[PDB]
Design a protein around this ligand. Sequence first.
Ligand code: CLA
Ligand code: CLA
Ligand code: CLA
Ligand code: CLA
Ligand SMILES: CCCCCCCC(=O)OCC(=C\C=C\C(C)=C\C=C\C=C(C)\C=C\C=C(/C)C=C=C1C(C)(C)C[C@H](OC(C)=O)C[C@@]1(C)O)/C=C/[C@@]12O[C@]1(C)C[C@@H](O)CC2(C)C
Ligand SMILES: CC(/C=C/C=C(C)/C=C/[C@@]12O[C@]1(C)C[C@@H](O)CC2(C)C)=C\C=C\C=C(C)\C=C\C=C(C)\C=C\[C@@]12O[C@]1(C)C[C@@H](O)CC2(C)C
Ligand SMILES: CC(/C=C/C=C(C)/C=C/[C@@]12O[C@]1(C)C[C@@H](O)CC2(C)C)=C\C=C\C=C(C)\C=C\C=C(C)\C=C\[C@@]12O[C@]1(C)C[C@@H](O)CC2(C)C
Ligand SMILES: CC1=C(C/C=C(\C)CCC[C@H](C)CCC[C@H](C)CCCC(C)C)C(=O)c2ccccc2C1=O
Lengths: 34, 80, 222, 74, 220, 73, 171, 130, 30, 153, 162
Amino acid sequence: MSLDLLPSFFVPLVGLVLPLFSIIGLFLYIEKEN
Amino acid sequence: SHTVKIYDTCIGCTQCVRACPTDVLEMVPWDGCKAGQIASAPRTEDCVGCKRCETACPTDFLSVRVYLGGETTRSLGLAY
Amino acid sequence: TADFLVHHIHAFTIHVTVLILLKGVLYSRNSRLIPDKANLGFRFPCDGPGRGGTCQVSAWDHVFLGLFWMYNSISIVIFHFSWKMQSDVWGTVSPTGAVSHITGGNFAQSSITINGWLRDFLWSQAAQVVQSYGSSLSAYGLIFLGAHFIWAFSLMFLFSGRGYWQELIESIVWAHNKLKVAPSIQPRALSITQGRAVGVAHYLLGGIGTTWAFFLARIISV
Amino acid sequence: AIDYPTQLSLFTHHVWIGGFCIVGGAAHGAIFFVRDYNAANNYNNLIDRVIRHRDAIISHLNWVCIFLGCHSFG
Amino acid sequence: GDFLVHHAIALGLHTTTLILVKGALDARGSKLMPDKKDFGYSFPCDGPGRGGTCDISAWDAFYLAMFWMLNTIGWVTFYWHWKHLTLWQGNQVQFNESSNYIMGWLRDYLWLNSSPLINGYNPFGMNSLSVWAWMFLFGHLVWATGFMFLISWRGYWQELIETIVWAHERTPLANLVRWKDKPVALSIVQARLVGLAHFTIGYVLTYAAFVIASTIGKLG
Amino acid sequence: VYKFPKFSKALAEDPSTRRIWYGIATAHDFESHDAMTESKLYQKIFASHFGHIAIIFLWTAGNLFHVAWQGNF
Amino acid sequence: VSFIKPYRQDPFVGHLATPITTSAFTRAYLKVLPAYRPGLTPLSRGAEIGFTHGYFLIGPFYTYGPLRSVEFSLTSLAAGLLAAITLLLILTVGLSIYGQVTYDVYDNALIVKLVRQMVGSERTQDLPQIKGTSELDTVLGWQKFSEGFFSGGLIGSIVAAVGIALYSTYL
Amino acid sequence: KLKQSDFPKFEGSTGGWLSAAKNEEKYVIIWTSKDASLFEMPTGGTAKMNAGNNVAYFARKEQCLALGSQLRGFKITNYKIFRIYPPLDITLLHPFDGVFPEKVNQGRSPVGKRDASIGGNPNPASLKFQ
Amino acid sequence: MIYDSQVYIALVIAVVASVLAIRLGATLYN
Amino acid sequence: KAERWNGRHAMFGWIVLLATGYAQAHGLLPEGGMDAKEWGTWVIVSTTNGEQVTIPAARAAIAIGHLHFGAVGVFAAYSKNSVKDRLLLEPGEKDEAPAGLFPALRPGLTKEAEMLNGRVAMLGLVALVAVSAATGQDILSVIDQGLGGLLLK
Amino acid sequence: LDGMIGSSAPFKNFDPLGFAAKADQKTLNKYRESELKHGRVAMLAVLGWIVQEFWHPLYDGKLSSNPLKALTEVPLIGWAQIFVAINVIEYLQNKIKELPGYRPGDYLGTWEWVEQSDEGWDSYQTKELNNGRLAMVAIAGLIVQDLITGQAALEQITAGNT
Ligand code: CLA
Ligand code: CLA
Ligand code: CLA
Ligand code: CLA
Ligand SMILES: CCCCCCCC(=O)OCC(=C\C=C\C(C)=C\C=C\C=C(C)\C=C\C=C(/C)C=C=C1C(C)(C)C[C@H](OC(C)=O)C[C@@]1(C)O)/C=C/[C@@]12O[C@]1(C)C[C@@H](O)CC2(C)C
Ligand SMILES: CC(/C=C/C=C(C)/C=C/[C@@]12O[C@]1(C)C[C@@H](O)CC2(C)C)=C\C=C\C=C(C)\C=C\C=C(C)\C=C\[C@@]12O[C@]1(C)C[C@@H](O)CC2(C)C
Ligand SMILES: CC(/C=C/C=C(C)/C=C/[C@@]12O[C@]1(C)C[C@@H](O)CC2(C)C)=C\C=C\C=C(C)\C=C\C=C(C)\C=C\[C@@]12O[C@]1(C)C[C@@H](O)CC2(C)C
Ligand SMILES: CC1=C(C/C=C(\C)CCC[C@H](C)CCC[C@H](C)CCCC(C)C)C(=O)c2ccccc2C1=O
């Protein structure tokens, strides 16, 4: 694996997966009850 | 719910009570003015904060004061 | 396809103006917010900061917003007319029958993007207005600038509120009283409804005057 | 027709006057509703029935406006 | 031209200072609200009577002074950028002559140097300045959305939201999904903040795009 | 709808979307938070300062790394 | 005659009995839909809804995607299929979180009667209240509904891709 | 035609109560009228009173009180407003002691009364971290 | 040109700084 | 629970690594690079001097196979009510008790056997990565050395 | 031949052959359903016949304007979709037929609102029935004329083949 494959590995990862999991966690947290 | 306070500058002219759209204020007996009456706020849970009460106040800087606070479906005027 | 998009823009703007005006007419007497809105009259600023805020619930405040949206719709309509005519109708005809237009048919391919409208229409045809100084069309450039000034002036009334202007007038009145020159007619800031009316009137005047000077200078020069 | 300034000015002026007059008609319809509208004299007529389902009209007009704006401008 | 623009800068500084100092000193109370300290730094208003009471809090003074700060910094940066564009290009006579009148600014700074930026992409192609033209349009759009949030106030957006709520509640295949928090219009102070944020972000983005793209496209 | 503005019970009881909006905009106004003392205020401000300086240094490190890796220094 | 009347003889509901809300055509058409069809388990409702939705969702992605082809291309079909499947995954995630935060019940149409009979002096909103008596209004019911939606979406997207390929090849 | 004979002759409006006044609370206003007068609903349009007992349901206390204020123009005074919780939990609201709040009645105690003017309020800085 | 080892260990050290960040984030409470 | 799942995945991945080595050795694993004209500019890795080096087609195929397996996993994750072993713990469920330093020596298809084999496979992957990083050869080269030569033959 | 709707002035209760004098209520409901379906289909068929004759924008022109000739020119995969749509519509009609209070030709469910029908409602139902009958006769004549002569409606009329 060359260093020039890192953008194609990371940019989709960050910019799509991190929003999805962050939205899941934030929605779950702000919709919690007591 | 909002907070409504009455101050002894009340002259008992009843204009606040008859201007409340949600029946929050009422006139109660008193001995601090000629009319012998003072406004009271015993139903502030229905207070909506429209401040019609203090728009009808003739005293110099008001005798009824509305302090907006925590919101409720009654205080937000939500029919839904 | 360029006329399809602009015609649907016209339909959309007309529909939004109709929405504002019809909401004003239908909800002029009562609503779920204010069940006795008819008792407050046609022209009133609000019912209060309660219910989360009851600004502009009147029916007048709907003729104010509808005036804004009518300005938007009519401005787009006249822009479409000006560009389409200059680009695909008006021009000169050669003796052999060749048609050359004022702009050269750029409407078909460059009126389909907002950058196209900004560059090939606004920037391009505003050349005559900005280069009118020293010529007989200089009055159009002066009115262009003055209408820009008036339109920007409107935003002071549209964006601000009275409490601030009343409290500033308080200090100005303090200075006048200190110099014994306070008028007997107590100076008060313009009412909320009048502030909105002044804002919308200045906005309409500035925008319409800017388009007026732009159109007249452009179509008289060429 | 060959006096382009005249044609452009006439069109723009008349369209502006038309838009202003239409907004004024809407304004005075609202004024009539606020002031001169009598509920008793308009029992179950067209005006009454329009007010009775104003929600439906305004909501569908809202949806149409969003659809048209989304599409054209987008 | 330097004299006149320095006086414009002084006017901007003085007016921003006036707004901010007035808000700071009048924060604890005034004649219109002699108990403003009891309502805190940021509150929407004091109501509809006694005249009116819009933008009476000290937070509103900050909110109004942000526009004047943006305008003053815009004047300062316009002056600096035009002076240095004329210095670098060599036509310092263009600034010294045209900077004394407003149309000189509008024609020779903005209209003149905006040509490379707007041609970052055309129906014929694009350049490395294409991102700057996109940011230019983006800043204009955010600026006008701020105009939305500033001109149109609440109350007009609460009734519309109520209509939307009714539409969602009374439609099949979507009644199965219901909100947990009741959708309401943004508060007056929140609306002022959001409009100010849009105004400022659009301002900054459009001017950054303009200055960078104009310098790059004019000076090679 | 009972645990996002942990620092404010008045907001946490709001049944509307205003609670979410105001939860963001009041998160750093520590003096207005529920069950608030001065010692906790200064300690939280101190820790926030540390996190902020860490953010600044990380930003500078990122600039350095990206110039070193993808730049033409 | 009048074809608009108050809904169910209640003039105070925010609803009307128009020739569209309460017409026999509307009744039958909504009662044959998977969401309201009688005799369906929540898994079956989810499976049918997912099948139909993936089937019509692969269409726009394949036709107008970033990798279109005026002729038939396997790459275009694969791109549309993957986009449709990922959109179904996003919708299933939304369904799962919605069901997680909405209901706390495992068997409905009973708990309501139990708390209307044996009293509900508790924290409420689980014993008392309870909106809707359908099997879709439970934690278990909505979970199976989401599972069925997801599986049926995959199957319907694959079936629609196969049909599109057959239509483009043999016609 | 209608569920109850005492309902006003209203044709129903899409401005009445919603799912909220089925699981949170609903408000009912009752009154007796001498004439079948035509009045305007707080929600929608025109309804017709009954020459006798009249009962109307609304989603807000303000709607019932606006209707009652309208009733005063018809020389109707005996109107009474109740709050109904999700089950039949009826609570009399508006004529709380049988006398309208604008008229002084013995047996009422002052609620929210401060024995000073506005200027006597404490300084906010003394109402902090405490 | 930096090597794969240089970038890899910088990524690993960045991970360690991330675990220290969540510990500070969680210690500043929910 | 997490340890058991990761052990299962590590064993399956030792199988996958063996399969990948076999495919590379036996002329499988397609040759060349992806078509940028067909799959957009996101498959372009670098442009040295006028030629676009793209993602290898072998890497794309292996990514597609891993996508198949990961999709199976995602389905099983959002299929909790129909799978024998769930991915996460139910509210109330309690985590199986740690096996300890040495899990019970229970041969066959037992929980202890799968536990021990998953731990062994995960340790093997850790050792493989450590050897590759320390010495500097490819992962498949390390596996080939650790199999004598019977994989890349 | 009952108090049923559809009795007009020229021939009130037109049952010269006595088909309804012996039938029960169920058979009469079936007869009314058949009559209304035939009338509606025939109105659609007549309108389509004429409009197709003087306007066929679809299928990029082509599809010869003479009906009974375009019947064999439609791609035959558009025929299948029309057939399936009609089938689904009639499945929905069958489902409607079991709704309580169902009336023979009433697929709108007007029995929900129309209790104690007026004279205007009966007159409008009779108008629909009479227009349907006239359209049935007209479409039968159209098909027969096009079969025997070979020309379409407005083509035969224009030439004068009457
Ligand atoms: C950092 C942010 C970011 C990134 C990296 C991307 C990346 C992408 N966008 Mg995108 N986008 C973003 C933000 C982002 N977007 C935002 C904020 C917006 C709104 C303004 C958009 C709006 C947008 C539109 C409107 C479109 C894209 C498209 C695309 C794709 C480029 C077109 C192409 O050649 O792929 C071709 C794509 C494929 C061959 C298939 C990709 C399908 C997904 C992305 C693959 C994900 C795999 C995933 C791991 C599967 C999980 C397992 C599952 C099977 C269960 C690419 C995947 C285009 C596209 O492809 O649409 C789908 C497109 O039409 N984007
Ligand atoms: C450029 C500034 C701007 C913009 C974009 C809008 C936009 C809009 N206004 Mg307006 N407005 C403005 C200025 C503007 N206004 C000003 C200055 C005023 C002051 C008078 C008003 C006063 C006003 C009123 C009084 C009303 C509106 C209404 C509307 C809406 C019409 C429905 C519609 O088209 O929605 C569609 C949205 C758009 C067209 C905006 C762009 C959306 C893009 C093109 C598509 C989607 C992008 C995508 C989701 C991005 C995702 C990626 C992202 C998450 C990163 C729309 C949101 C009406 C309303 O409420 O709606 C019915 C209405 O009643 N406006
Ligand atoms: C704050 C500093 C900072 C910023 C703004 C960026 C910005 C960027 N980096 Mg980056 N990077 C940084 C520091 C930073 N870097 C450091 C310190 C490293 C060394 C580990 C890297 C290593 C790195 C690689 C290897 C790659 C990028 C890439 C990118 C680009 C796409 C985003 C991405 O994939 O991130 C991925 C970033 C990482 C994996 C490293 C983590 C970044 C730092 C350590 C975290 C900083 C967090 C910040 C302070 C606040 C977080 C907010 C959060 C809570 C929401 C983008 C321009 C990609 C690129 O060039 O695409 C063209 C890419 O492939 N970065
Ligand atoms: C029994 C009815 C019937 C039938 C079998 C046909 C059959 C045909 N028509 Mg046609 N048509 C009809 C009625 C009918 N038409 C009516 C009433 C009109 C007037 C609007 C037309 C107008 C028309 C035109 C303009 C064209 C055709 C054409 C055609 C031919 C190609 C199919 C096509 O594109 O249809 C197109 C049909 C339409 C555009 C309109 C159909 C509207 C339907 C009949 C009403 C709604 C039906 C609904 C789904 C079911 C009723 C619901 C409820 C009552 C239960 C085909 C031979 C085309 C051709 O090749 O001509 C030679 C052509 O260009 N038709
Ligand atoms: C990665 C491989 C490396 C090889 C190198 C080259 C090969 C390659 O490139 O591969 C990629 C490739 C194909 C890969 C296909 C794969 C991995 C398919 C896998 C399918 C998995 C399935 C069905 C799992 C089912 C599990 C279940 C049901 C799991 C389960 C259970 C059970 C069983 C326990 C039962 C339980 O029961 C209860 C209680 O529910 C439920 C559950 C969930 O627990 C093709 C690649 C290329 O074609 C492309 C792309 C281009 C061509 O030009 C070149 C080639 C041919 C190479
Ligand atoms: C999970 C793991 C490996 C997972 C591998 C998996 C899933 C397999 C994946 C693959 O199949 C795929 C998917 C696809 C194939 O193509 C590729 C592979 C890769 C083959 C290794 C973990 C390896 C984890 C290791 C080695 C952990 C070591 C932890 C230690 C030493 C902790 C010590 C402490 O805890 C104490 C003792 C006391 C505390 O107080 C202090 C500290 C110090 C924190
Ligand atoms: C278990 C394992 C693989 C298991 C595979 C399984 C179950 C596959 C099951 C299958 O169903 C699938 C999935 C798919 C089917 O199609 C195929 C089959 C087969 C049916 C690999 C372990 C692989 C384990 C490996 C490689 C272990 C390496 C260990 C090393 C190097 C140890 C070094 C040390 O011991 C020394 C030297 C000295 C010590 O002091 C220090 C240390 C460091 C501890
Ligand atoms: C400035 C301002 C005031 C103060 C404005 C005042 C007091 C108007 C003063 C007008 C002067 C006194 C007369 C007009 C003088 C002009 C030079 C005459 C007009 C020019 C002619 C050519 C028409 C408000 O009262 C107000 C209220 C609500 C929202 C915004 C605002 C607002 O922005």
